[PDB]
């Protein structure tokens, strides 16, 4: 059991969950700077 710490000091499956949500939130915000063929991208 003592050898277990040496193998740690693996958790990529846990970091992937964090990454996938961070990437969807970074993309969702960036999609606000798009004109989609309009004259501008700002409603004011």
């Amino acid at each position: 059991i003592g050898k277990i710490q040496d193998s740690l000091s693996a958790l990529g499956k846990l970091q992937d969950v964090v990454n996938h949500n961070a990437q969807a939130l970074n993309t969702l915000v960036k999609q606000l700077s798009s004109k989609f063929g309009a004259i501008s991208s700002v409603l004011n």
Binding site: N26, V29, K30, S33, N44
Partner: protein
């Protein structure tokens, strides 16, 4: 607020950033303005929602 063209909404507070001596405002990651410099007093102010 409007700072010489920069139009926005938010709370203005004293910052702790240091711009270069030619830069007016800063942006955060994802490219949204988060700090400006007052044209008259030359002080950096954060913009929080």
């Amino acid at each position: 607020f409007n700072f010489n063209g920069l139009t926005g909404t938010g709370v203005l507070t004293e910052s702790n950033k240091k711009f270069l001596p030619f830069q007016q405002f800063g942006r955060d990651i994802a490219d949204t303005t988060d700090a400006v410099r007052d044209p008259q007093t030359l002080e950096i102010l954060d913009i929080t929602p």
